[PDB]
Amino acid sequence: MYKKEYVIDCKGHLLGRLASLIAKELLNGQRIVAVRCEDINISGSLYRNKLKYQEFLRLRTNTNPKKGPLHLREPSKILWRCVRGMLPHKTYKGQLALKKLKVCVGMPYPYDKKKKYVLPSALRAFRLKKHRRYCRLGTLSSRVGWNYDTLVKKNEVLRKQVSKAYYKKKVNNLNEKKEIKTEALNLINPEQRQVLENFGY
């Protein structure tokens, strides 16, 4: 809302709730970059969402399909269109809000180590009954003709290993910082020690 830009990991996020929240942020003026859109999940069976997308696919302008609704198959573009359908893109302010949004499949280069945020209002674990049926946007998009799911998965696993390496570096950095803190506490004057102790610092 007030940050320069918010990066959202779309993994395990319900499409409609995520789109509504993101669109509200764009309208309020907060720049949003959405990553890993191919792990967005949609309520209802995968066959149900496949039928819905087939019904959307069979729909085009009869006279000239060029101006027909550009269907788009990438999950990032699907999320972008869902967000666009949530805000007044026909107006200037709505167009600005729409252009204030970036969507990516996987995690591209300038999103390796900026904090990916998660909005619990759109989590599957909190917004869907466990015994009910859900889908996966990457799988649905591959079914409707994306043919890039596997490449994103291989890039994601390579990124997993890459990030794990420097997380293992960071944990040792933090646990040496805490132990130097333990010894530096007793080099501070006692009255300054008391305030830190009783304020939990």
């Binding site: 009869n62 006279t63 000239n64 399909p65 990438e74 499949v105 996987g106 890039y148 490449l151 994103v152 890039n155």
Partner: protein, 337 residues
């Protein structure tokens, strides 16, 4: 209401728009795929229009009504002035398509190839590719290590030499030919040898294999519906002429559909002919490659009386079934299946 006599439409929507092609050479949308098991070798070729001729044969198809009896067929013989391999390009897959990591040129380059990069060669200083061919090999080694670590599709810039052909054109046609085969570790060594020399067709082209042909068809300018889509001619009693489509759509939708045949440009389209099996391998200098031991006469690939609007042919030959698109002097592209 419905039509009383339903009949198939005119033309195919799969070749739309029927517009003039942007270029003269035949581009390739798709190259044959690769497999880890199969060994690293070449993946395509190119040449010119030597001939789409006949040959007499004998079918071996069981139960055929001709079979043992002699038959006449229709195949083609290709013109292959050897292409000079000049460049190497690496591609890596991304969710946005396959992206060029880098291209590397041969340390020595031809003048015909460089002439293509110009529009007025006779007036220029011929400064292209002058100081870009003096790079150290440390950079090459580092970038090819990067290619091995990252790149997954390997292509070779090859250019033809129109000087061998009788064409008026002096610019060289440049394309890139994929290299298909095994993994990166074998592929790196398998792409370290041919980087400068010209291309002999018989290196990989072998009998009993299927290939495809890519070209640009002839040109006819603007043509009517009766020629572009072969619509029925209107009766002679028609008032404002008979060489047109009568109804170009119903009242609703209140627009002209894009499926309605209309006048416009016919020809100069991109065409690919599939399922064209290669059959035989030969040469240019030798004297008995095309003929057989049962023919016992003298002849080579040489033609008679000259070729109408093509000159004479003084280059390689192979054999391959079918006939080709385009016109005389038109560049043809040969892909594997």
């Amino acid at each position: 209401s419905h039509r009383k006599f339903e009949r198939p439409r005119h033309g195919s929507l799969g070749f739309l728009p029927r517009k003039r092609c942007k270029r003269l050479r035949g581009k390739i949308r798709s190259f044959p795929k690769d497999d880890k098991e199969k060994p690293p070798h070449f993946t395509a070729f190119m040449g010119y229009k030597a001939g789409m001729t006949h040959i007499v044969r004998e079918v071996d198809k069981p139960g055929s009504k001709l079979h043992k009896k002699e038959i006449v067929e229709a195949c083609t013989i290709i013109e292959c002035a050897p292409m000079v391999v000049v460049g190497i390009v690496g591609y890596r897959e991304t969710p946005k398509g396959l992206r060029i990591l880098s291209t590397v040129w041969a340390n020595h380059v031809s003048d015909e190839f460089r002439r293509r990069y110009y529009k007025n060669w006779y007036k220029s200083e011929k400064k292209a590719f002058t100081k870009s061919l003096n790079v150290p090999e440390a950079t090459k080694n580092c970038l090819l290590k990067r290619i091995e670590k990252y790149c997954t599709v390997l292509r070779a810039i090859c250019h033809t030499q129109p000087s061998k052909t009788p064409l008026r054109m002096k610019k060289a046609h440049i394309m890139e030919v994929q290299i298909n085969g095994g993994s990166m570790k074998e592929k790196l060594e398998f792409v370290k040898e041919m980087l400068e020399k010209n291309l002999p067709v018989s290196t990989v082209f072998n009998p009993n294999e299927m290939i495809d042909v890519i070209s640009v068809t002839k040109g006819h300018g603007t043509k009517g519906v009766v020629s572009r889509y072969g619509v029925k001619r209107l009766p002679r009693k028609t008032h404002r002429g008979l060489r047109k489509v009568a109804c170009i759509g119903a009242w609703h939708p209140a627009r002209v559909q894009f499926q309605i045949p209309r006048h416009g440009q016919k020809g100069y389209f991109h065409r690919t002919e599939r399922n064209k099996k290669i059959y035989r391998i030969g040469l240019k200098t030798d004297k008995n490659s095309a003929s057989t031991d049962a023919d016992i006469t003298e002849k080579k690939i040489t033609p008679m009386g000259g070729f109408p609007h093509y000159g004479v042919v003084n280059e390689d030959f192979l054999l391959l079934k079918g006939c080709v698109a385009g016109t005389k002097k038109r560049p043809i592209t040969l892909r594997k299946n």
